[PDB]
Ligand binder design. Structure first.
Ligand SMILES: Cc1cc2nc3c(=O)[nH]c(=O)nc-3n(C[C@H](O)[C@H](O)[C@H](O)COP(=O)(O)O)c2cc1C
Ligand SMILES: Cc1cc2nc3c(=O)[nH]c(=O)nc-3n(C[C@H](O)[C@H](O)[C@H](O)COP(=O)(O)O)c2cc1C
Lengths: 200, 200
């Protein structure tokens, strides 16, 4: 099966979510050596804001698109196709300014596509991604899960994933990382324990 | 006083939030002809993703910055300064894929600045923007305020605004816009009634 490994942290080697997302993927490869991994670093190679141009490009026939429109259309196509092909997705999801990074939301905007990851039916919208397994690697400076301050982060992500039909979701969490070295170390240690004994 | 008018819709003349944000500002000008308006269309002139480069530029002395770093630093400075100067802010805030547009969040990332719009104290973080009035123009295809599906939209915005100390907040809402022409028309009519009789 195909595993898509997504990072969105802007903090590079100092990133908690990049460390933990890599650790989930390493654990996964060890548990299933046949897994095929595709990597996408949404911070290193940022996806353009979903724009009026994105919409115009989508509604313009390929043979009449200019270069900028071909760019937007290919960006939309390649991102969507990579997600559709994936059987499992590991997503690094920092909390920056009370929500996810715009680098991550820009990816979400390309994968939330009517007719592909969800569809409209006479009975209402139906998610089409129910076969996909997702591991969300959720990292934050504070501890606000289950509280209003956390609305834009895990709650939002759960809404999006639920809408496209994901039912098989695990959250690997390391929160309170800004409260000092000992608290940061334990939060990461606990997340590693989840990876080691509660994922596979 | 200085009013900052922000739009983030990608739908141009078909935008509900651009129509209503303009109507709030027109009403404001009529109520207070001395108000000075500054406009920023975050969709037409999109702010770069808040990135590793943004952080590096901020920590690099001006005299050693290269051109790309001067760009990031000026973008950060001009956006922040415009917000600090504003006494009132009218913000067009569509719901796209269960949250705000990345164009709007990229602005939030430049205005959430320690020491400027909030500060760390020995007693915890304190918002510094309590004198500012904000009118949020909230538009959505569905009706999900007060429900989990709405977490990434108004709930998130209220968290951000509360953190930087905004207490004087009004929300002008037009939701259910995707459910048909009559429902869209009434939602906009109700929002116009709020503007006419419940804002000023
Ligand atoms: C630009 C920026 C914004 C942040 N905003 C928040 C925030 O709103 N709430 C919070 O709890 N932590 C916040 N943090 C702390 C991060 O959530 C924390 O450092 C986490 O480890 C980020 O994941 P990462 O290390 O993989 O980048 C922010 C950090 C940065 C760099
Ligand atoms: C790319 C895109 C994504 C959208 N996602 C949502 C959504 O998640 N939930 C919703 O209720 N409406 C959604 N809508 C509908 C918009 O919220 C609605 O059209 C609203 O009027 C947008 O504000 P605007 O007209 O100022 O652009 C979406 C519209 C677009 C174009």
């Amino acid at each position: 099966m195909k595993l898509l490994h997504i990072d969105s942290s802007i903090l590079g080697d100092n990133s908690a979510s990049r460390q933990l997302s890599r650790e989930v993927v390493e654990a996964w490869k060890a548990a299933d050596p046949s897994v095929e991994v595709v990597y996408r670093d949404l911070a290193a190679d940022a996806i353009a804001h979903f724009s009026a141009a994105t919409l115009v490009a989508a509604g313009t026939p390929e043979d009449v698109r200019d270069a900028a429109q071909a760019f937007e259309a290919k960006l939309s196509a390649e991102t969507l196709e990579e997600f559709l092909a994936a059987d499992a997705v590991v997503i690094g999801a920092p909390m920056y300014n009370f929500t996810v990074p715009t680098q991550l939301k820009a990816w979400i905007d390309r994968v939330a596509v009517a007719g592909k990851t969800f569809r409209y039916t006479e009975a209402g919208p139906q998610g089409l991604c129910g076969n996909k397994k997702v591991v969300l690697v959720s990292t934050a400076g504070g501890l606000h899960a289950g509280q209003p301050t956390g609305a834009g982060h895990e709650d939002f992500l759960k809404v999006f994933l639920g809408f496209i039909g994901i039912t098989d979701l695990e959250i690997v969490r390391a929160h309170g990382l800004a409260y000092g070295p000992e608290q940061r170390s334990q939060a990461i240690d606990a997340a590693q324990a989840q990876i080691a004994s509660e994922l596979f």
